Amino acid sequence: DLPKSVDWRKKGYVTPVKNQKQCGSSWAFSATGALEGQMFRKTGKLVSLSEQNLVDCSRPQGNQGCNGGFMARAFQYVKENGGLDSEESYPYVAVDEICKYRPENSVAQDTGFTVVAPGKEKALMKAVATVGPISVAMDAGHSSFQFYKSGIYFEPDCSSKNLDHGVLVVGYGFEGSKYWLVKNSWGPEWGSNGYVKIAKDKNNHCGIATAASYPNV
Amino acid sequence: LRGGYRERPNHQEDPKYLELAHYATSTWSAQQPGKVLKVETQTVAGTNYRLTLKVAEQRTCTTVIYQNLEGEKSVSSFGCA
Partner residues linked to A181 by β-bridges: A171, A197
Backbone φ, ψ for residue A152 (5° rounding): -100, 120
How far apart, in whole angstroms, are the C-alpha atoms of residue A172 and residue A135?
A: 14
Q: Bridge partners of A84?
A: A108
Q: Contact B3/A19, CB-based, under 8 Å?
A: no
Q: Count how many domains chain B has.
A: 1
Query: Rg of chain B's alpha carbons, rounded to an integer?
Result: 13
Q: Could you tell me if residue B45 is inside a domain?
A: yes
Supply the DSSP symbol for A140.
-
Q: Does A21 touch chain B (CB under 8 A)?
A: yes
- Distance, CA of A46 to CA of A68 (rounded, Å): 26
Contact across the interface for B43 and A140, Cβ inside 8 Å? yes
Separation in Å, CA of B42 to nearest CA in chain A? 7
What's the N-to-C CA distance of chain B in angstroms?
A: 24
In a domain, residue A51? The reply is yes
Residue among A20, A22, A69 minimizing CB distance to B2: A69
SS3 state at A71: helix
The span from the CA of A215 to the CA of A139, in Å, is 22
Over its C-alpha atoms, chain A yields an Rg (Å, rounded) of: 16
The domain in which residue A178 lies consists of: 6-216
Within a domain: A1: no
Q: How far apart are CA A115 and CA A72, in angstroms?
A: 8
Number of domains in chain A: 1
Sign of CA dihedral A90, B62, B11, B30: positive
Q: What is the residue range of B16's domain? A: 6-80
Enumerate residues preceding breaks in chain B (C to N > 2.5 Å): 35, 57
Residue pair B66/B73 in contact (Cβ under 8 Å)? The answer is: yes
Q: Which residue of A has its CA nearest to B75?
A: A22
According to DSSP, residue A105 is labeled: G
CATH of the domain at A203: 3.90.70.10
In degrees, rounded to 5, the angle at the alpha carbon of residue A186 between the alpha carbons of residues A117 and A27 is 35
- Assigned domain for B18 exists: yes
Phi, psi of A9 (to 5 degrees): -60, -35
Report DSSP letters for A171-197, one per residue.
Answer: EEEE---EEEEEE-SB-TTSTBTTEEE
Q: Give DSSP secondary structure letters for B25-69.
A: HHHHHHTSS----EEEEEEESEEEEEEEEEE---EEEEEEEEE-T
Distance CA A53, CA A90 (A): 7
Taking alpha carbons only, the member of A16, A17, A32 closest to residue A71 is A32
Pick from A68, A189, A190: CB nearest B4: A68
Would residue A17 be called left, alpha or beta, if left means φ above 0 and alpha means ψ between -120 and 50 degrees?
beta
For A143, the enclosing helix (H) or strand (E) is: helix A143-146
Residue B64: its chain A contacts at CB < 8 A?
22
The experimental method is: X-ray
In a domain, A164, yes or no: yes
Distance CA(B29)–CA(B19), nearest Å, equals: 15
Q: Are A169 and A212 in contact (CB under 8 A)?
A: yes
Instruction: Find chain B residues with C-beta within 8 A of A23's C-beta.
Output: 44
Spatial distance between the Cα atoms of A54 and A28, rounded to a whole number of angstroms = 6
d(CA B58, CA A25): 34
CB A86 within 8 A of CB A105: yes
> What CATH number is given to the structural domain containing B13?
3.10.450.10
